[PDB]
Amino acid sequence: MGRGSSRLGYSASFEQFHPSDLLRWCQLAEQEGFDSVLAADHFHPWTPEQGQSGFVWAWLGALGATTRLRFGTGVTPPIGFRYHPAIVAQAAATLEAMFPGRFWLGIGAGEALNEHIVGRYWPEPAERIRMLIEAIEVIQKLFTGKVIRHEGVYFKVESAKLYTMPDVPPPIIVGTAGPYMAKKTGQLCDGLLTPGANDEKLRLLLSRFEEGARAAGKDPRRMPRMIQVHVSWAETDEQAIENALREWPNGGMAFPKGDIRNPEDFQAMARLVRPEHFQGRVLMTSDLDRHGEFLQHLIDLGFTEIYVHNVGRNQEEFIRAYGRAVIPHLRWPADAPVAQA
Amino acid sequence: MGRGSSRLGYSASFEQFHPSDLLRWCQLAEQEGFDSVLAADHFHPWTPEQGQSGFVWAWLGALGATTRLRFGTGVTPPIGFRYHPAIVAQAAATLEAMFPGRFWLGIGAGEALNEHIVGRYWPEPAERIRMLIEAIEVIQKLFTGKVIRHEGVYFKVESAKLYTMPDVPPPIIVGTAGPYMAKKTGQLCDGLLTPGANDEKLRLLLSRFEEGARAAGKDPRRMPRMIQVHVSWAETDEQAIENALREWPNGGMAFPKGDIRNPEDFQAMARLVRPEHFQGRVLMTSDLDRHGEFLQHLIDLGFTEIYVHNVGRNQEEFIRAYGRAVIPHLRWPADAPVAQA
Amino acid sequence: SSRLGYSASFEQFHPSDLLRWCQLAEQEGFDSVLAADHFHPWTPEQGQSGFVWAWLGALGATTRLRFGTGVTPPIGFRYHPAIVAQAAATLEAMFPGRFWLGIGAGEALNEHIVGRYWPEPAERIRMLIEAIEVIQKLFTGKVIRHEGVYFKVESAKLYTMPDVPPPIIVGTAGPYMAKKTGQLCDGLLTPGANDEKLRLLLSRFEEGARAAGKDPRRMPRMIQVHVSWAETDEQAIENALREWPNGGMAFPKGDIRNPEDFQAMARLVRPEHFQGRVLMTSDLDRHGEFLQHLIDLGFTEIYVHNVGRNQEEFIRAYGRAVIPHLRWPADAPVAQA
Amino acid sequence: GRGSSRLGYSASFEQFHPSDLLRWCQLAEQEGFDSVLAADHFHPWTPEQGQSGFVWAWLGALGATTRLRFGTGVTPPIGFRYHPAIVAQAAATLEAMFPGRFWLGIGAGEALNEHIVGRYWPEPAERIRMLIEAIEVIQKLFTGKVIRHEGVYFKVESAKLYTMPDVPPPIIVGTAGPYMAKKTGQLCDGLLTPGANDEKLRLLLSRFEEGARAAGKDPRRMPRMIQVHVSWAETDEQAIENALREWPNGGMAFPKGDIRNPEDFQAMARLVRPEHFQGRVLMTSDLDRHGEFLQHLIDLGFTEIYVHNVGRNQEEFIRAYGRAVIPHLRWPADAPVAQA
Amino acid sequence: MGRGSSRLGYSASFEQFHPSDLLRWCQLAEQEGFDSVLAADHFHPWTPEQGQSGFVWAWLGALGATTRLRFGTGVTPPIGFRYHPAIVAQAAATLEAMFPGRFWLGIGAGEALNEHIVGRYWPEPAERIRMLIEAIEVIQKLFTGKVIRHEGVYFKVESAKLYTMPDVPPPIIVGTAGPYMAKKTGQLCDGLLTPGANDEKLRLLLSRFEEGARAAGKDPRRMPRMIQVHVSWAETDEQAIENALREWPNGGMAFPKGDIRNPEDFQAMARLVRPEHFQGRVLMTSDLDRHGEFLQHLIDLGFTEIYVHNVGRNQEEFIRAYGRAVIPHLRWPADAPVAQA
Amino acid sequence: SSRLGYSASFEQFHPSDLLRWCQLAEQEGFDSVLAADHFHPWTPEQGQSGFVWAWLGALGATTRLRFGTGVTPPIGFRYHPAIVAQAAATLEAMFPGRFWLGIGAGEALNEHIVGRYWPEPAERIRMLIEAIEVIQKLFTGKVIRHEGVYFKVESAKLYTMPDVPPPIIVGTAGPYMAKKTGQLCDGLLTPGANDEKLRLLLSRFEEGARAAGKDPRRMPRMIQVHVSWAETDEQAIENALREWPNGGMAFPKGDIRNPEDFQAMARLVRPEHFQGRVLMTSDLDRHGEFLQHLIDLGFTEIYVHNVGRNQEEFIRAYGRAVIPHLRWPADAPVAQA
Ligand SMILES: [Cl-]
Ligand SMILES: [Cl-]
Ligand SMILES: [Cl-]
Ligand SMILES: [Cl-]
Ligand SMILES: [Cl-]
Ligand SMILES: [Cl-]
Ligand SMILES: [Cl-]
Ligand SMILES: [Cl-]
Ligand SMILES: [Cl-]
Ligand SMILES: [Cl-]
């Protein structure tokens, strides 16, 4: 079962788990055949019941120094609320310098849950895309390793340079579910990361990313196409359903969530969520064959990397279960591109 | 000899050394009797000849996960240029949660070398102190672990909470050489960190810190008093002098440096610096006895922690030399307070 | 005397229709109109949002009903407080004894269009309190200046005033703002809610007024309720579900910007989420008992929003079966000068 | 006349209680006036004038009790008193309720009204640039789709007018400036100008026309409207004193858009004398002479005239014009008018 | 013909006259018994017909170096439109340093005619008073000759010092016709300058100034009380009237003028002005006895200095006429206070 | 004819002294004065900073010298460009043919006092170019408006003008700004530097002017130098070291805010750091050869700053031994209308 080596991605949910636990689980995931970690960049969890939000950048240093996994932010908003783009560039450059060939910088337009804390105007999605495109320009200038200046609508950078660089900069991955930003990702950056969705919408995002890259003279067959999915595995279908309902009610909220400020808001909205609202959106089953079929389908659509978030608190059992029953049976095309320098 | 256990601090100079090297050297320093690491928070080095500036926050995660050392920023400016205070609080809380009893948050008013890159008005020292005091208020509110709001002159914080906390928050250490801020440090924070200076000026800072703490009802005898010094050790006096002159000319710049924007500026100013300009200010000698006497004197003034920066590139030889000849012979008072929760 | 309030839902109905229905409601025993101040409806399915201030002039000139905004946010997004004051003063000058100015902290649905920083609820309360101070200064009829955190008013005066200014009614469901309403304003307007929460708001309003030396027994206490009447219980339930899903959203709604957002959230709403929150029944006796209960809690005015599109049938049904059977205490205070 | 008898009545919010204005407009309808121009003020020019109703509420009353056409003359939709998005909603609501009757008159505004919000007051040329941007915003909203806008002066997040008429109301620009007249023809539906000498009126008409042609429109089907101030009374003497006491700003032959307070105008009024009104305000009891004055303007090519009597004798004035003036005015047939 | 020496002030109208002419006329005025010059600080004239506006600060250097007259601005608005208060302080200090005992700094709330050119929000009078009071605080701090900082609502001053100072700073004179600001002038400054007005209103201003000074512990008997008047002298009453009407129509504008932006605006308003509008407000007569009586009356009200602006272009004839017929016959109380260090 | 420029160092000398020395310099063969526009001196030891604009009026009225600012930053810290234009126009109106307006990008030492963001050099160049546009519009003598990135000018006009406006001279050591100076302004002012760098600046200024259709051979090319003359080489060296340590600071100084900062940095400065940068000698022949060399490179004006406090002896010494022996090309252009 597979032309290429066995591999899979593990989603580290900072929303839900203490960072000490996540470190231990990633070390275990490595042992069990996972090859890469996607790590959320939150300040707040969605709900109090999830109850965590570690500073990912400190944690990534620990992961880098204790595993040989690849790893990335999924995703950092470098648009000047929590984080100035110049600093994100330095962080990315430092991590890749220390852990060459292992880091990938995942960026996106952000959500108010996290960015509202600094008490600034929150622009509409389209405008935040414009801010993201400018941030990408800044990160890329800094990645050249020369002294650079920048003056655009949203950011001003005085004479700045990254003195600590890797020989080759880390790839910039854009996390987006928007067709416009997908095109811009292919045009401006190295790879795409998208959440799970129906086939039609995934195929549109891949398509836009590809035509953006070609339009800019790049070869999209050598550019990574990554997906993050939310699943619930447990010992029975019953515990799998309840796990999703209690731990990840935001997974049943089929509506835009980027304007909602507080965990307490999501928690109140969660009172509406029912098991039906998860179909198509979060796979809830104990049947590990069905997990494998779900994942294989995504590979077949043309994703070259998959990052899996189990929503239950049964993270250790989940990692071992996927290691034995799922990861070995996934067929990856050989020499598929992966987020790496 | 000594009433308390043998110990000393190592300064990790991000200005000069690749972060991979610093990690290895800290691991070695642990083996050789150093107990704690002070880590610079820079974006730029002072000169191109120094030639580095890793993102400290990622590096600290690696240090935490691979040593048992105590460690701290020396120092982070949490005043909304590079870093918003809310984020510094999250970073500090995450580090201490992962490495309990090991992290201390060192903060200060910042220098333009690092903060100018975001292209905002750079206030005079006194005003930056006002900004620092407000930032301290924000960090402390977030450290309570409750949902907090803040609205002052410099910062606005919408409903925010740290979900990922240690049982006990890390100490806040203020890095300053100003009598006013020393008093405020004793009043508002947990400990003081100061650079090397003549006895009279050190005794004034200690004195102000103490009376600030008493005025606020605290016991200053249980609050850490920390100093950071720059030395040059090498095989001969000649190499020790040249090491300082080539690697750390800013050490011969007896003047306030916090308004100067570019490495290229310091480098041009360095052309003026001569060996004479270092006396009193950087100890330059191969005589390890004289190193020990210098350090012991500081202990006797009442410092409870010393962090030593060797300015030469001979970091490994320096660590081994101090481990054998210096650290074992330093007499620390027993039950002296140290930066720890 | 027999009376009841009619809620004009600008979210749902063309303003020409609302005018005709208010004229009919007058004929059928309703005495007062509460009129929403929206720019956007909650959902596209509701599909309207007339400019209330123009419409109120038409209502004033063609009926003898009392009427009020429920509610205007005078905090400098859509509307500067100085202008709200002028509008209020003009309406009351033209229709003396008939207008009441209802104000509140606003929702992003309407205010986000001007593209400014949207503060948290508590901060918007601070803005509302400042706006109240501005409106009250202007209502004195003198030349006034104001300089606070949120608003600046250069030398300004209302030359067109009534002999007595219209009452300022605050629309809120928050205990803190209820107390401030009693302390600073003339009366309270609250949405329908369980008895425990209504009794707490009334209580806070009352003790706010007493703390400031006022007599709360002479200050109006107004409630707006959402009901669904139709020919059968079945159509009543479906009417609520299709036309007013926001009534099943028991959670803060003031940060959500777009109708399209509410419409997507509506997919979650179910009939169960309306109990206690929207009365859904064809039994007009049960409508009467529900309303009488609210009178007895101590509300002196009730404004009724039927959520169905069957507005004409609803008005006639209430006129025959409900309004004549409601017992109002004599000399209950009402929003008026 | 080739076309039906008609004339416009100016409702002076500066001077009269809005209840009175409503009654007088109802009377004006009865007497052959066909349209109302309504000032959008916050403050009167002088305390002696002593009023300033909120026009938008009043217009709802007018719409519901008459069959007259009516318009703002003029609203400044440039974000002092009024954000352009709100003006659009107001306009769309009025036309939805009173289809074929409303016209939205806009202009660059005066400090008398806008200074109350305590913001920087730009020079006329800059306020024109703000007006042009406001026009763009109103027109996008009038499309009835969800629209966004980001220009120098205004930001509009996702917004839509759900309550619209089948056809949007015309946008009329009130200006006396050659540049803005051209832009009005290019961008909007019709022109409104104050009284002035023939040469200056002919220049404004000319600029409006060539602006419209340059943009591919037919200016012969676009309204050309003028607002004039007259004083009619029982004798020449009362006509003169009425103007002097009630409308001294009519003798202030100088730009007035920077002056902030009624008390300022009132102090300046002490300078004004009867002589300063010649050319600028017709002051006579001779209704023939009123008719000749108005006919002249029709002949220059104005298709609508709005008349403000400055005296407090509004009822007598309306009846006098109804009997002696309006019936004798010769309007070209099928002349364009501010409407659907 | 007087207890004290013969003296009078000459108003240099920059609105009307080329600065080369004004210099020559002041030199003549010195010869003819005038002792001091008041110099307007305009950017624009009131009307194009007046047709001038020299930069007063350059001109005052020429006056200082070629006469022995006292001189002052009447008045400079130091409120950050045309002029930042720190610069006004430097200008004042430099003039008094070069011409000790001769300069007095006259300040006021400004008019839009001059300040509108920089395109900033123009506040109402009362607010501009608040700005003036803050400016006064800044000028006074700088006048101490120490390194000073300031941070208030309207102005920010970083570490600043006047290195070039006189031994004693020049007096600050406030030009105002407002009872409130008159009181504040006595409380905060050194002297009052007011325009002509009826006796009742002048007596109120003097009275308020005096009680402001006493309330703040100062001695108002040693503080100058100065008035600026506009007169029209010519060979006949007819030319005197026409001179005023054509050259100074703003003198017949009995209304607040501080909001009007353009000369073209005043010029259009001037078409309304008639001879009658000047009574009480500008003395128009060829009878030099009547000029003397007018001026003596003001001395008797309690003014210690009078500055006379002849509105006609007949400046030379006016100076000679006053020198022969008026100045010698004015009775000044001996040792009356005068604007001087 | 014999001529030379005198630099009036406001940083070091009381303005009363500078006036007297300029009057003497006129007597001794100097023809023009360059006057610093400072708020602060470099060091407390220098100890002065008169407001130059007032002083220039005194100079104008008591000498027949030409004079100019060297240089004013008209970029809206200390000085708004509209005001600089008025000042320039007034001076030239009073002293026709004598004033030249020297402008530049400014230093923080002077501009930081108003407590605004201090941009990097390149950005300050952009600000300077916009300021030049403003000054030039005002110099047309018509009513003008301006709206750019950095400045806004409402309807403004200079009513007091000379028949011909004063030349605008840009003080810069940057090749980019030199080209822009030739393109936009009337003349160049540069500090002393090696031949290669001076020849590049002249070259860039020339090709900027040609590109814009001007004749650069009729446009002034001015240089400002710092020298130390005294009775012996020893006193000349010590004078430079004690009075003008900033002359030994071979590094960009435009970001340093305080005199106290420069004073502390001065503790590093040694005699060696002045070679190439400040001529330190008692040999007046060597002074003459230094100056003649600059004339030969193609400078048409030289302004000399003696750094010692021996200003009177210096002026007399140059008058006798230097100025008479300098060979200037006839009909060389000079800063004048
Ligand atoms: Cl993978
Ligand atoms: Cl599907
Ligand atoms: Cl230690
Ligand atoms: Cl010592
Ligand atoms: Cl009711
Ligand atoms: Cl209940
Ligand atoms: Cl008409
Ligand atoms: Cl005098
Ligand atoms: Cl009197
Ligand atoms: Cl020369």
From TrEMBL, chains A, B, E:
InterPro entries: F420-G6PD/mer, F420_G6P_DH-rel, Luciferase-like_dom, Luciferase-like_sf. Residues 15-304 form the Luciferase-like domain. Keywords: Oxidoreductase, Plasmid. Pfam families: Bac_luciferase. It comes from the Bacteria. GO terms for molecular function: oxidoreductase activity, acting on paired donors, with incorporation or reduction of molecular oxygen. The keyword Oxidoreductase applies. The keyword Oxidoreductase applies. Coiled coil: none annotated. This is Luciferase family protein. It comes from Thermomicrobium roseum (strain ATCC 27502 / DSM 5159 / P-2).
Automatic annotation (TrEMBL), chains C, F:
InterPro entries: F420-G6PD/mer, F420_G6P_DH-rel, Luciferase-like_dom, Luciferase-like_sf. Keywords: Oxidoreductase, Plasmid. Residues 11-300 form the Luciferase-like domain. The keyword Transcription does not apply. Transmembrane segments: none annotated. PANTHER family: 5,10-METHYLENETETRAHYDROMETHANOPTERIN REDUCTASE, PTHR43244. This is Luciferase family protein.
Automatic annotation (TrEMBL), chain D:
GO terms for molecular function: oxidoreductase activity, acting on paired donors, with incorporation or reduction of molecular oxygen. Keywords: Oxidoreductase, Plasmid. It comes from the Bacteria. CDD domains: Tetrahydromethanopterin_reductase. The keyword Flavoprotein does not apply. Residues 14-303 form the Luciferase-like domain. The keyword Oxidoreductase applies. Pfam families: Bac_luciferase. InterPro entries: F420-G6PD/mer, F420_G6P_DH-rel, Luciferase-like_dom, Luciferase-like_sf. PANTHER family: 5,10-METHYLENETETRAHYDROMETHANOPTERIN REDUCTASE (PTHR43244:SF1), PTHR43244. This is Luciferase family protein. The lineage of its organism: Bacteria, Pseudomonadati, Thermomicrobiota, Thermomicrobia, Thermomicrobiales.
